[PDB]
């Protein structure tokens, strides 16, 4: 999950300087929230 955590934070730091459009980070963010909820129901 730390692989996809690093992937999401790299995509967000390449969003907050407008290097990436908002819809891609929106669906990628919902994918990360799904992964977080799976990791919280797993623990």
């Amino acid at each position: 999950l730390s692989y996809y955590r690093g992937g999401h934070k790299d995509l967000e730091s390449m969003f907050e300087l407008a290097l990436e459009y908002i819809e891609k980070l929106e669906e990628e963010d919902e994918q990360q929230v799904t992964d977080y909820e799976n990791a919280m129901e797993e623990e």
Partner: protein, 377 residues
Amino acid sequence: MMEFTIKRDYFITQLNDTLKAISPRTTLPILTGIKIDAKEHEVILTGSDSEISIEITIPKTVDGEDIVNISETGSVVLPGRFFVDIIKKLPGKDVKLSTNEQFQTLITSGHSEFNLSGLDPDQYPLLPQVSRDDAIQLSVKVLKNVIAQTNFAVSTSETRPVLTGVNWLIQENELICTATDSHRLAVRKLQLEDVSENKNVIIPGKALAELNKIMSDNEEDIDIFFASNQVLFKVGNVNFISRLLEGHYPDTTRLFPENYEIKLSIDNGEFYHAIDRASLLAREGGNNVIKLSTGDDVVELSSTSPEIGTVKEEVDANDVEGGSLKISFNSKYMMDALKAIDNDEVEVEFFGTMKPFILKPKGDDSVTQLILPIRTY
């Protein structure tokens, strides 16, 4: 018992500015709210988070048309994000707030009638007062250019809380705006129009990214007033107090070596979208490192990854000196430093394979971005 009837189409765009200082992480329950204060001729919207604070005087007339009609003076502290969420949804072009005792405001707009629960404005903390000497007058276009060319390179880690702010070094009519996160550097030189004292201040990174938003691109001026701990960005009909960071900013003049080996003169759009393409493979791994390979009139932006494959661009560099060089940089630090260039022809010069390299525009000797090497060791 505040009571005023402001035009909604102006109150949204002057309330969405003072929302930007309301952060929903403050330990006080009062600093997560917008203080609206209608005086006899103006309405101020003090929004703070004990670090930055925005006071927006909305007068009774803006460019001739009437805006506010204060029926009774007073003040209330409505909740922060939710009240802007109310005002963005109302149907009419008039929003009539009316506070009563125990501070409940009846937000009437046409047919809709909210009734919030504001807090007592007497327990809202006082605004930090900034002395009106040490005046520095920039323009809106010049200061938005400085914030665009410098406030990307601040640190987002509070372990070293001096690198999380933009240094402004005023000495003899020159403004030197640097920003370092120990991997980048963005030094904007700027000559002023007046004389100013020797200032060495550290304006924070998120205290100018929230100023770049609240400044509409106009011909007005930001009278910047410095104090010992605060700085007043008095834009037209909007103040902006922000807290100067403490400590001494580290000397970044030792990070400028000389005797360039190769010197490109490459396009900005081509070499920006080519970093945008070449980092697609190496950003799903989490890291973002692109190998560059300079050749004759080409810049071979390469990358690789297991299980995905290989990408190899070829960007036309219009003037290359020296020889060939294989540097391995970071793609976000290159795309930020190419987005900051207003020009469409940057002039990259490389200092060997293990040293920083200048990314400056040609025709402008003021702004020189610099990327420290994150190549292999």
